[PDB]
Amino acid sequence: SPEALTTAVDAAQQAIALADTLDVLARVKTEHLGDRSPLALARQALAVLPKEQRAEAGKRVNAARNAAQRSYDERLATLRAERDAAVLVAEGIDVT
Amino acid sequence: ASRVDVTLRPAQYLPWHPGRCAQVFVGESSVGHAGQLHPAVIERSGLPKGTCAVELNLDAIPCSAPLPAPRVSPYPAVFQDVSLVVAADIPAQAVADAVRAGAGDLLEDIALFDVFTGPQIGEHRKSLTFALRFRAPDRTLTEDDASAARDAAVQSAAERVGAVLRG
Amino acid sequence: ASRVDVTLRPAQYLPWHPGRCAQVFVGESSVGHAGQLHPAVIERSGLPKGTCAVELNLDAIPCSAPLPAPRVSPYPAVFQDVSLVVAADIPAQAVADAVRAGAGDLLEDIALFDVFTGPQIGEHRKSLTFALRFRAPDRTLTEDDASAARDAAVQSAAERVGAVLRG
RNA sequence: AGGUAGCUCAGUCGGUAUGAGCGUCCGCCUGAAAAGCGGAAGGUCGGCGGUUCGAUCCCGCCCCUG
């Protein structure tokens, strides 16, 4: 259902920002962006509808899917940056 | 091999690991760096994990022609150990320098052989234990005279790096 | 430092420990001894316990002027380990020589890294495990061709020191 | 003519990459190994841009080898 996708983006962008662990975010991904995700089921249903309803219904699906991707990508890079930074601190030694 | 004294100091300088990198000084002149390479550099470069590296500028190391004239004392030595608690980020070389500065001329050798952390010590702290060898040049050093030099070494460590004698 | 190959063989020669003494040979010529000193010699002499010693005759070591011309194969290597049970008094160098003699030219490196005794092996026995690195000079060696060289190495160890492949 | 997982390759004709061997990492096995089986992780599909609601797939240019 087009324009009803805004409830799936809000449910994803808040579940993505809530994850503070790479393992938690890995499960949040497949639930909201995986092959079985509702946002993925909206893209698979773009070749069965007629041609006249394909240029506009897909623009609302691609906009709702790219909005959730950016929230995931920016959250994945953030959590991986914090992980990498913590390794450098934990690996500190007395060089003298 | 160059017959020069060198100090190693904490530093951050790519491609070395910011927590496992030392800058090498001869006197107050920097001559290079050493330590483990940055894990991100290692990953992007396809290098083995944990690869380490060192680079020095030989032309910055002045050629030394020392003519030692050592005087060896044959008198017996006194062996004593001291255990000092400092903040965890106090470099071990600074604690030893402070001990050496307080011990005076009677101190012949100092060697760190234990670095301990745990609930016995407390958080943000670490315990260091040094083996001290005292020796007089003209007499058999007494246990008390050595302890006076040890007490002065402990007092010096307390003033310079905040070392607390362990109890 | 002398650029000579040396073999060490069990020997009994005072003041060395009869069970921890090696005689040193260059070819078939004896050049000296090494190992731990006899505990009775150490006791009577007031020496530190466990004192070790070595003495070689330099004039018996012929001066060598080798001109190496190595050929380095760039082709990939095959890594395989072999575990061999021998009698406990079979010297480990004899087992390695037998493995090397059976492996042939494909064997680039052999390294002993485990010496094991226990009820799994049996009394009067010991198990030795070697790391083998095979490499061909003109082709990428296959896993099978390396195993054929390994099987021949195991057969050679069986015939010369009675080594039994561990199972 | 091809470029696709770290490697070697099969394959996908605009709206789901799907994979196979090696390698790697685990599990069984060994006191520990190797070798074995067994499981698994593992992919802006050569780069920059058109076109398109959407490009590994079509168009332009460029990089790479035969």
Short mmCIF file of N, CA and C in Angstrom, two decimals, chain C:
data_model
loop_
_atom_site.label_atom_id
_atom_site.label_comp_id
_atom_site.label_asym_id
_atom_site.label_seq_id
_atom_site.Cartn_x
_atom_site.Cartn_y
_atom_site.Cartn_z
N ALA C 1 78.88 -18.76 12.65
CA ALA C 1 79.93 -17.75 12.46
C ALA C 1 81.12 -18.32 11.72
N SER C 2 81.38 -19.62 11.86
CA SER C 2 82.44 -20.30 11.14
C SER C 2 82.00 -20.80 9.77
N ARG C 3 80.71 -20.69 9.45
CA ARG C 3 80.15 -21.18 8.19
C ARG C 3 80.48 -22.66 7.97
N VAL C 4 80.21 -23.47 8.99
CA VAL C 4 80.36 -24.92 8.91
C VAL C 4 79.12 -25.58 9.49
N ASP C 5 78.81 -26.77 8.96
CA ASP C 5 77.73 -27.59 9.49
C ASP C 5 78.26 -28.48 10.61
N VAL C 6 77.43 -28.70 11.62
CA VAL C 6 77.84 -29.37 12.84
C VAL C 6 76.76 -30.36 13.24
N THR C 7 77.18 -31.54 13.70
CA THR C 7 76.27 -32.51 14.31
C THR C 7 76.65 -32.70 15.77
N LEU C 8 75.63 -32.89 16.61
CA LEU C 8 75.81 -33.12 18.03
C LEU C 8 75.37 -34.54 18.36
N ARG C 9 76.21 -35.28 19.08
CA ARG C 9 75.97 -36.68 19.35
C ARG C 9 76.09 -36.96 20.85
N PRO C 10 75.29 -37.88 21.38
CA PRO C 10 75.38 -38.21 22.81
C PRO C 10 76.78 -38.66 23.18
N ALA C 11 77.23 -38.24 24.36
CA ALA C 11 78.57 -38.57 24.81
C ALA C 11 78.64 -38.46 26.32
N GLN C 12 79.65 -39.13 26.88
CA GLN C 12 79.97 -39.05 28.30
C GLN C 12 81.41 -38.58 28.42
N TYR C 13 81.61 -37.40 28.99
CA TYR C 13 82.93 -36.79 29.04
C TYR C 13 82.93 -35.76 30.16
N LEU C 14 83.67 -36.05 31.23
CA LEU C 14 83.76 -35.13 32.35
C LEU C 14 84.44 -33.83 31.91
N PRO C 15 84.06 -32.68 32.50
CA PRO C 15 83.15 -32.52 33.64
C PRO C 15 81.67 -32.36 33.29
N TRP C 16 81.26 -32.81 32.11
CA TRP C 16 79.87 -32.66 31.71
C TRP C 16 78.99 -33.77 32.29
N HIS C 17 77.71 -33.45 32.43
CA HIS C 17 76.68 -34.39 32.86
C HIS C 17 76.56 -35.52 31.84
N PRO C 18 76.72 -36.78 32.24
CA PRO C 18 76.70 -37.88 31.26
C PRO C 18 75.41 -37.99 30.47
N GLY C 19 74.29 -37.49 30.99
CA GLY C 19 73.03 -37.50 30.28
C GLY C 19 72.67 -36.22 29.57
N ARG C 20 73.47 -35.17 29.73
CA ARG C 20 73.23 -33.86 29.14
C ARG C 20 74.50 -33.33 28.49
N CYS C 21 75.24 -34.22 27.83
CA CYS C 21 76.50 -33.89 27.19
C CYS C 21 76.44 -34.28 25.72
N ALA C 22 76.86 -33.36 24.86
CA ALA C 22 76.94 -33.61 23.43
C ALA C 22 78.38 -33.47 22.97
N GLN C 23 78.82 -34.40 22.13
CA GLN C 23 80.08 -34.24 21.43
C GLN C 23 79.80 -33.61 20.07
N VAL C 24 80.62 -32.62 19.71
CA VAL C 24 80.40 -31.80 18.52
C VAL C 24 81.33 -32.28 17.41
N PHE C 25 80.74 -32.60 16.26
CA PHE C 25 81.48 -33.10 15.11
C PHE C 25 81.31 -32.15 13.92
N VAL C 26 82.39 -31.93 13.19
CA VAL C 26 82.36 -31.30 11.88
C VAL C 26 82.74 -32.39 10.88
N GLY C 27 81.76 -32.87 10.12
CA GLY C 27 81.97 -34.10 9.39
C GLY C 27 82.09 -35.24 10.38
N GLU C 28 83.12 -36.06 10.23
CA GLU C 28 83.39 -37.14 11.17
C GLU C 28 84.51 -36.80 12.15
N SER C 29 84.93 -35.54 12.21
CA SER C 29 85.99 -35.10 13.10
C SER C 29 85.40 -34.46 14.35
N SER C 30 85.80 -34.96 15.51
CA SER C 30 85.40 -34.35 16.77
C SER C 30 86.11 -33.02 16.97
N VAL C 31 85.35 -32.01 17.42
CA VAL C 31 85.90 -30.69 17.66
C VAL C 31 85.64 -30.18 19.07
N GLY C 32 84.87 -30.90 19.88
CA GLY C 32 84.67 -30.47 21.25
C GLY C 32 83.41 -31.08 21.85
N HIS C 33 82.94 -30.44 22.93
CA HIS C 33 81.82 -30.93 23.71
C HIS C 33 81.02 -29.75 24.24
N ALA C 34 79.78 -30.04 24.66
CA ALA C 34 78.91 -29.01 25.23
C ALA C 34 77.82 -29.67 26.05
N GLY C 35 77.19 -28.87 26.90
CA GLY C 35 76.07 -29.32 27.70
C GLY C 35 76.18 -28.81 29.12
N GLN C 36 75.47 -29.48 30.02
CA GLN C 36 75.46 -29.11 31.42
C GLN C 36 76.57 -29.85 32.16
N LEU C 37 77.19 -29.17 33.12
CA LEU C 37 78.28 -29.77 33.88
C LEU C 37 77.75 -30.81 34.86
N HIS C 38 78.62 -31.75 35.21
CA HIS C 38 78.26 -32.82 36.13
C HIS C 38 77.89 -32.23 37.49
N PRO C 39 76.79 -32.67 38.11
CA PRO C 39 76.41 -32.10 39.41
C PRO C 39 77.43 -32.37 40.51
N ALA C 40 78.21 -33.44 40.40
CA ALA C 40 79.25 -33.70 41.38
C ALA C 40 80.44 -32.77 41.19
N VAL C 41 80.78 -32.46 39.93
CA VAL C 41 81.81 -31.47 39.66
C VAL C 41 81.37 -30.10 40.17
N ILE C 42 80.11 -29.74 39.91
CA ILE C 42 79.57 -28.46 40.37
C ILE C 42 79.61 -28.38 41.89
N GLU C 43 79.24 -29.47 42.57
CA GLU C 43 79.23 -29.47 44.03
C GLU C 43 80.63 -29.31 44.60
N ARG C 44 81.58 -30.11 44.11
CA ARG C 44 82.94 -30.05 44.64
C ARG C 44 83.64 -28.74 44.31
N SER C 45 83.23 -28.08 43.23
CA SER C 45 83.90 -26.86 42.79
C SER C 45 83.26 -25.59 43.33
N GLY C 46 82.12 -25.69 44.01
CA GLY C 46 81.43 -24.50 44.46
C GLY C 46 80.83 -23.67 43.35
N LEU C 47 80.51 -24.30 42.22
CA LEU C 47 79.91 -23.60 41.09
C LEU C 47 78.41 -23.46 41.30
N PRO C 48 77.77 -22.52 40.59
CA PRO C 48 76.31 -22.46 40.62
C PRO C 48 75.69 -23.75 40.10
N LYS C 49 74.56 -24.12 40.68
CA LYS C 49 73.83 -25.29 40.20
C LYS C 49 73.38 -25.08 38.76
N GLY C 50 73.40 -26.16 37.98
CA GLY C 50 72.98 -26.09 36.60
C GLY C 50 73.93 -25.38 35.65
N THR C 51 75.16 -25.11 36.08
CA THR C 51 76.12 -24.44 35.21
C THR C 51 76.38 -25.26 33.96
N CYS C 52 76.42 -24.58 32.81
CA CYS C 52 76.65 -25.22 31.53
C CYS C 52 77.96 -24.72 30.93
N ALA C 53 78.48 -25.48 29.97
CA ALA C 53 79.79 -25.15 29.41
C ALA C 53 79.89 -25.71 28.00
N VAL C 54 80.81 -25.12 27.23
CA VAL C 54 81.12 -25.56 25.88
C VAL C 54 82.59 -25.26 25.61
N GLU C 55 83.28 -26.19 24.97
CA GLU C 55 84.65 -25.95 24.51
C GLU C 55 84.86 -26.62 23.16
N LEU C 56 85.31 -25.85 22.18
CA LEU C 56 85.61 -26.35 20.85
C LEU C 56 87.05 -26.01 20.49
N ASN C 57 87.64 -26.84 19.63
CA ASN C 57 88.97 -26.60 19.08
C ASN C 57 88.81 -25.90 17.73
N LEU C 58 89.11 -24.60 17.70
CA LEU C 58 88.94 -23.84 16.46
C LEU C 58 89.86 -24.33 15.35
N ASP C 59 91.07 -24.76 15.70
CA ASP C 59 92.00 -25.24 14.69
C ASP C 59 91.54 -26.55 14.05
N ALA C 60 90.66 -27.29 14.72
CA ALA C 60 90.07 -28.49 14.13
C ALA C 60 88.87 -28.17 13.24
N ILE C 61 88.36 -26.94 13.28
CA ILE C 61 87.27 -26.51 12.42
C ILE C 61 87.89 -25.94 11.15
N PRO C 62 87.78 -26.61 10.00
CA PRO C 62 88.43 -26.11 8.79
C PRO C 62 87.78 -24.81 8.32
N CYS C 63 88.63 -23.88 7.89
CA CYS C 63 88.13 -22.62 7.35
C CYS C 63 87.37 -22.87 6.06
N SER C 64 86.13 -22.40 5.99
CA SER C 64 85.28 -22.59 4.83
C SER C 64 85.08 -21.26 4.12
N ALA C 65 85.14 -21.29 2.79
CA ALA C 65 84.90 -20.12 1.95
C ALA C 65 83.79 -20.46 0.95
N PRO C 66 82.56 -20.64 1.42
CA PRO C 66 81.49 -21.07 0.51
C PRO C 66 81.04 -19.94 -0.40
N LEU C 67 80.66 -20.32 -1.62
CA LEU C 67 80.12 -19.41 -2.63
C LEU C 67 78.73 -19.91 -3.00
N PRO C 68 77.72 -19.62 -2.18
CA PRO C 68 76.37 -20.11 -2.48
C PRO C 68 75.83 -19.54 -3.78
N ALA C 69 75.02 -20.34 -4.46
CA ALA C 69 74.29 -19.91 -5.65
C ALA C 69 72.87 -20.45 -5.56
N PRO C 70 72.07 -19.90 -4.64
CA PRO C 70 70.74 -20.46 -4.41
C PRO C 70 69.80 -20.19 -5.57
N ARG C 71 68.86 -21.11 -5.77
CA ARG C 71 67.79 -20.94 -6.73
C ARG C 71 66.47 -20.97 -5.96
N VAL C 72 65.75 -19.86 -5.98
CA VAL C 72 64.55 -19.68 -5.18
C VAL C 72 63.34 -19.98 -6.06
N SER C 73 62.54 -20.96 -5.65
CA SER C 73 61.33 -21.29 -6.40
C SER C 73 60.19 -20.38 -5.97
N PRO C 74 59.55 -19.66 -6.90
CA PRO C 74 58.42 -18.80 -6.53
C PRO C 74 57.09 -19.52 -6.46
N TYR C 75 57.04 -20.80 -6.81
CA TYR C 75 55.78 -21.51 -6.89
C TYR C 75 55.23 -21.78 -5.49
N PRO C 76 53.91 -21.92 -5.36
CA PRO C 76 53.31 -22.09 -4.03
C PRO C 76 53.79 -23.35 -3.35
N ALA C 77 53.80 -23.30 -2.02
CA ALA C 77 54.22 -24.42 -1.19
C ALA C 77 53.02 -25.17 -0.64
N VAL C 78 53.25 -26.42 -0.26
CA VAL C 78 52.24 -27.26 0.38
C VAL C 78 52.71 -27.56 1.79
N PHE C 79 51.85 -27.28 2.77
CA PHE C 79 52.17 -27.47 4.18
C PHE C 79 51.48 -28.72 4.70
N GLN C 80 52.27 -29.62 5.29
CA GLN C 80 51.76 -30.86 5.86
C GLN C 80 52.55 -31.20 7.11
N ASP C 81 51.87 -31.78 8.09
CA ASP C 81 52.50 -32.23 9.33
C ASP C 81 52.44 -33.75 9.42
N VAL C 82 53.47 -34.33 10.02
CA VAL C 82 53.56 -35.77 10.20
C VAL C 82 53.94 -36.06 11.64
N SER C 83 53.29 -37.06 12.23
CA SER C 83 53.47 -37.40 13.64
C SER C 83 53.94 -38.85 13.73
N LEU C 84 55.13 -39.05 14.30
CA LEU C 84 55.82 -40.33 14.26
C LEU C 84 56.18 -40.79 15.66
N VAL C 85 55.86 -42.05 15.97
CA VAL C 85 56.19 -42.66 17.25
C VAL C 85 57.46 -43.49 17.09
N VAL C 86 58.46 -43.20 17.92
CA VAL C 86 59.72 -43.95 17.95
C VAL C 86 60.01 -44.35 19.38
N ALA C 87 61.03 -45.20 19.54
CA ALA C 87 61.53 -45.51 20.87
C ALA C 87 62.05 -44.24 21.54
N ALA C 88 61.91 -44.18 22.86
CA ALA C 88 62.19 -42.94 23.58
C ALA C 88 63.65 -42.52 23.46
N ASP C 89 64.56 -43.46 23.24
CA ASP C 89 65.99 -43.16 23.15
C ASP C 89 66.47 -42.99 21.71
N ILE C 90 65.57 -42.88 20.75
CA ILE C 90 65.95 -42.57 19.37
C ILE C 90 66.14 -41.06 19.27
N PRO C 91 67.34 -40.58 18.91
CA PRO C 91 67.56 -39.13 18.84
C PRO C 91 66.69 -38.48 17.77
N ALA C 92 66.16 -37.29 18.10
CA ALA C 92 65.22 -36.63 17.20
C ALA C 92 65.87 -36.25 15.88
N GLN C 93 67.18 -35.98 15.88
CA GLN C 93 67.86 -35.65 14.63
C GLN C 93 67.90 -36.84 13.67
N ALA C 94 67.96 -38.06 14.20
CA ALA C 94 67.96 -39.23 13.32
C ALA C 94 66.61 -39.44 12.66
N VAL C 95 65.52 -39.12 13.36
CA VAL C 95 64.19 -39.24 12.78
C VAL C 95 64.01 -38.20 11.68
N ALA C 96 64.47 -36.97 11.91
CA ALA C 96 64.36 -35.93 10.90
C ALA C 96 65.20 -36.24 9.67
N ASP C 97 66.43 -36.73 9.86
CA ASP C 97 67.26 -37.12 8.73
C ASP C 97 66.59 -38.19 7.88
N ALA C 98 65.94 -39.16 8.53
CA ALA C 98 65.26 -40.21 7.77
C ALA C 98 64.06 -39.65 7.02
N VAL C 99 63.31 -38.74 7.65
CA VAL C 99 62.20 -38.09 6.95
C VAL C 99 62.72 -37.30 5.75
N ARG C 100 63.78 -36.51 5.96
CA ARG C 100 64.34 -35.72 4.88
C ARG C 100 64.84 -36.61 3.74
N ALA C 101 65.45 -37.75 4.07
CA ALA C 101 65.99 -38.63 3.04
C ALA C 101 64.89 -39.27 2.20
N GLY C 102 63.71 -39.46 2.77
CA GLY C 102 62.62 -40.05 2.02
C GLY C 102 61.78 -39.03 1.28
N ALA C 103 61.79 -37.78 1.76
CA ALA C 103 60.96 -36.75 1.15
C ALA C 103 61.49 -36.33 -0.21
N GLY C 104 62.80 -36.34 -0.40
CA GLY C 104 63.35 -35.99 -1.69
C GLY C 104 63.54 -34.49 -1.87
N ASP C 105 63.63 -34.09 -3.14
CA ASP C 105 63.93 -32.70 -3.47
C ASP C 105 62.75 -31.77 -3.24
N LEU C 106 61.53 -32.31 -3.18
CA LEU C 106 60.37 -31.46 -2.96
C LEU C 106 60.32 -30.89 -1.54
N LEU C 107 61.05 -31.47 -0.60
CA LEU C 107 61.04 -31.00 0.78
C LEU C 107 61.90 -29.75 0.90
N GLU C 108 61.27 -28.62 1.21
CA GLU C 108 61.98 -27.36 1.37
C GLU C 108 62.38 -27.10 2.82
N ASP C 109 61.52 -27.47 3.77
CA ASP C 109 61.78 -27.20 5.17
C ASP C 109 61.14 -28.29 6.02
N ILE C 110 61.82 -28.65 7.11
CA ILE C 110 61.30 -29.59 8.10
C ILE C 110 61.64 -29.05 9.48
N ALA C 111 60.64 -29.00 10.37
CA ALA C 111 60.82 -28.45 11.70
C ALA C 111 60.08 -29.30 12.72
N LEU C 112 60.81 -29.78 13.73
CA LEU C 112 60.20 -30.47 14.86
C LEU C 112 59.58 -29.45 15.80
N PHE C 113 58.31 -29.64 16.15
CA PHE C 113 57.65 -28.72 17.07
C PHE C 113 56.89 -29.41 18.20
N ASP C 114 56.96 -30.73 18.32
CA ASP C 114 56.27 -31.41 19.41
C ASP C 114 56.98 -32.71 19.76
N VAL C 115 57.24 -32.91 21.05
CA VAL C 115 57.79 -34.15 21.58
C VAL C 115 56.88 -34.58 22.73
N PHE C 116 56.15 -35.68 22.54
CA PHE C 116 55.08 -36.05 23.46
C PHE C 116 55.28 -37.47 23.98
N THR C 117 55.11 -37.64 25.29
CA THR C 117 55.05 -38.95 25.92
C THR C 117 53.76 -39.03 26.72
N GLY C 118 53.31 -40.26 26.97
CA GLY C 118 52.10 -40.46 27.72
C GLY C 118 51.45 -41.80 27.44
N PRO C 119 50.42 -42.14 28.21
CA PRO C 119 49.75 -43.43 28.02
C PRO C 119 49.11 -43.60 26.66
N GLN C 120 48.78 -42.50 25.97
CA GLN C 120 48.26 -42.61 24.61
C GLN C 120 49.29 -43.24 23.68
N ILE C 121 50.57 -43.04 23.97
CA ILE C 121 51.64 -43.51 23.09
C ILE C 121 52.13 -44.89 23.51
N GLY C 122 52.26 -45.12 24.80
CA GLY C 122 52.81 -46.36 25.31
C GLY C 122 54.15 -46.14 25.99
N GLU C 123 54.50 -47.08 26.86
CA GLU C 123 55.75 -46.98 27.59
C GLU C 123 56.95 -47.17 26.66
N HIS C 124 58.06 -46.55 27.04
CA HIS C 124 59.34 -46.60 26.32
C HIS C 124 59.27 -45.96 24.94
N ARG C 125 58.18 -45.26 24.63
CA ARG C 125 57.98 -44.62 23.34
C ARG C 125 57.87 -43.12 23.51
N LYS C 126 58.01 -42.41 22.39
CA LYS C 126 57.76 -40.98 22.34
C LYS C 126 57.24 -40.64 20.95
N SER C 127 56.43 -39.59 20.87
CA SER C 127 55.85 -39.13 19.62
C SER C 127 56.49 -37.81 19.23
N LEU C 128 56.89 -37.70 17.96
CA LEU C 128 57.48 -36.49 17.40
C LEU C 128 56.63 -36.03 16.24
N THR C 129 56.35 -34.72 16.18
CA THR C 129 55.55 -34.15 15.11
C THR C 129 56.37 -33.08 14.40
N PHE C 130 56.51 -33.23 13.08
CA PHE C 130 57.29 -32.33 12.25
C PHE C 130 56.37 -31.52 11.34
N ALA C 131 56.71 -30.26 11.14
CA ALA C 131 56.06 -29.42 10.14
C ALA C 131 56.86 -29.50 8.85
N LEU C 132 56.21 -29.94 7.77
CA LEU C 132 56.86 -30.10 6.47
C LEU C 132 56.35 -29.05 5.50
N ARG C 133 57.27 -28.44 4.76
CA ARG C 133 56.93 -27.50 3.70
C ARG C 133 57.50 -28.04 2.39
N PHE C 134 56.62 -28.46 1.49
CA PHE C 134 57.00 -28.96 0.18
C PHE C 134 56.86 -27.86 -0.86
N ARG C 135 57.72 -27.91 -1.88
CA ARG C 135 57.67 -26.93 -2.95
C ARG C 135 58.38 -27.49 -4.18
N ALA C 136 57.75 -27.32 -5.35
CA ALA C 136 58.31 -27.71 -6.63
C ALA C 136 59.06 -26.53 -7.25
N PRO C 137 60.11 -26.81 -8.04
CA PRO C 137 60.88 -25.71 -8.64
C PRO C 137 60.29 -25.17 -9.92
N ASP C 138 59.36 -25.88 -10.56
CA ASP C 138 58.92 -25.51 -11.90
C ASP C 138 57.41 -25.61 -12.09
N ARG C 139 56.64 -25.81 -11.03
CA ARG C 139 55.20 -26.02 -11.16
C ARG C 139 54.55 -25.81 -9.81
N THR C 140 53.23 -25.63 -9.83
CA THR C 140 52.45 -25.56 -8.60
C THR C 140 52.23 -26.98 -8.10
N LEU C 141 52.85 -27.32 -6.98
CA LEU C 141 52.77 -28.68 -6.46
C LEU C 141 51.34 -29.00 -6.01
N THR C 142 50.87 -30.18 -6.38
CA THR C 142 49.54 -30.62 -5.99
C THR C 142 49.56 -31.25 -4.60
N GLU C 143 48.39 -31.23 -3.95
CA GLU C 143 48.27 -31.85 -2.63
C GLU C 143 48.63 -33.33 -2.68
N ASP C 144 48.29 -34.01 -3.78
CA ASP C 144 48.59 -35.43 -3.90
C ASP C 144 50.09 -35.66 -4.08
N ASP C 145 50.73 -34.91 -4.97
CA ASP C 145 52.17 -35.07 -5.17
C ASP C 145 52.94 -34.80 -3.89
N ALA C 146 52.46 -33.89 -3.05
CA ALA C 146 53.12 -33.65 -1.77
C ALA C 146 52.90 -34.82 -0.82
N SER C 147 51.69 -35.39 -0.82
CA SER C 147 51.43 -36.54 0.03
C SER C 147 52.26 -37.76 -0.38
N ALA C 148 52.54 -37.90 -1.68
CA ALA C 148 53.41 -38.99 -2.12
C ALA C 148 54.82 -38.81 -1.55
N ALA C 149 55.33 -37.58 -1.56
CA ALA C 149 56.62 -37.31 -0.94
C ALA C 149 56.56 -37.50 0.57
N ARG C 150 55.43 -37.15 1.19
CA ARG C 150 55.27 -37.38 2.62
C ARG C 150 55.22 -38.87 2.94
N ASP C 151 54.47 -39.65 2.15
CA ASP C 151 54.43 -41.09 2.35
C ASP C 151 55.82 -41.70 2.23
N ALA C 152 56.59 -41.25 1.24
CA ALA C 152 57.95 -41.75 1.09
C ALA C 152 58.83 -41.34 2.27
N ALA C 153 58.59 -40.15 2.83
CA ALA C 153 59.33 -39.74 4.02
C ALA C 153 58.98 -40.62 5.22
N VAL C 154 57.70 -40.95 5.37
CA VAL C 154 57.27 -41.82 6.47
C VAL C 154 57.84 -43.22 6.29
N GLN C 155 57.86 -43.73 5.05
CA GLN C 155 58.44 -45.04 4.79
C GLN C 155 59.93 -45.05 5.13
N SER C 156 60.64 -43.97 4.81
CA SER C 156 62.06 -43.89 5.12
C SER C 156 62.30 -43.88 6.62
N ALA C 157 61.49 -43.11 7.36
CA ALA C 157 61.63 -43.09 8.82
C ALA C 157 61.34 -44.46 9.42
N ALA C 158 60.40 -45.19 8.83
CA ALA C 158 60.08 -46.53 9.34
C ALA C 158 61.27 -47.47 9.18
N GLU C 159 61.97 -47.39 8.05
CA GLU C 159 63.05 -48.33 7.77
C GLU C 159 64.31 -48.02 8.57
N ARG C 160 64.56 -46.75 8.87
CA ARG C 160 65.82 -46.33 9.46
C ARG C 160 65.78 -46.16 10.97
N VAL C 161 64.64 -45.78 11.55
CA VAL C 161 64.57 -45.59 13.00
C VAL C 161 63.32 -46.27 13.56
N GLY C 162 62.64 -47.06 12.73
CA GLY C 162 61.47 -47.78 13.20
C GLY C 162 60.29 -46.90 13.55
N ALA C 163 60.17 -45.74 12.91
CA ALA C 163 59.07 -44.83 13.22
C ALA C 163 57.74 -45.41 12.76
N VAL C 164 56.73 -45.29 13.62
CA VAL C 164 55.38 -45.75 13.33
C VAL C 164 54.48 -44.52 13.20
N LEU C 165 53.76 -44.44 12.08
CA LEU C 165 52.83 -43.34 11.88
C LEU C 165 51.74 -43.39 12.93
N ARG C 166 51.48 -42.26 13.57
CA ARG C 166 50.57 -42.23 14.70
C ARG C 166 49.12 -42.25 14.24
N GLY C 167 48.31 -43.04 14.93
CA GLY C 167 46.90 -43.14 14.61
C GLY C 167 46.02 -43.07 15.84
#
